[PDB]
Amino acid sequence: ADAAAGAQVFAANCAACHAGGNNAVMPTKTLKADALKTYLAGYKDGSKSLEEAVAYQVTNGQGAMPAFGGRLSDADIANVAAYIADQAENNKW
Numbered sequence: 001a002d003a004a005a006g007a008q009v010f011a012a013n014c015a016a017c018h019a020g021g022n023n024a025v026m027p028t029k030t031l032k033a034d035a036l037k038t039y040l041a042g043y044k045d046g047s048k049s050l051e052e053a054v055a056y057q058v059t060n061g062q063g064a065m066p067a068f069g070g071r072l073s074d075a076d077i078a079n080v081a082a083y084i085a086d087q088a089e090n091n092k093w
């Protein structure tokens with residue numbers, strides 16, 4: 001997928017709550033590498049890659065994290081998942 005495209009998807013859809021890779025609503029569940037490994041389903045136990053685990057979360061929602069399946073294309077979701085993985089793993093935030 002395309003992380004650069006994903007930065008645009010993020011700006012349009014995610015930055016209200018996750019500017020800086022943080023979380024304005026639930027402060028512990030950030031988009032940083034340590035928090036993602038602690039909290040994110042699938043990724044947390046090695047059953048999914050970070051990209052796949054983020055795509056699932058984005059598509060389906062959790063708590064006050066909205067579901068974007070049907071609002072964003074599969075491509076956009078894959079791209080934003082690639083973007084988060086890249087930002088987190090590379091400590092770019």
Ligand code: HEM
Nearest residue numbers: 013014017025026029030035036039040054062063064065
């Ligand atoms: C498509 C844009 C978005 C993406 C890619 C995204 C991504 C994610 C990811 C990957 C997580 C898990 C973080 C972790 O486990 O440490 C998360 C959690 C969360 N996000 Fe988002 N997010 C988006 C939009 C939003 C928006 C707009 C809001 C605010 C209205 C929001 C609020 C939250 C909240 C509250 C959680 C924690 C949910 C919980 O487990 O209780 N997110 N998001």
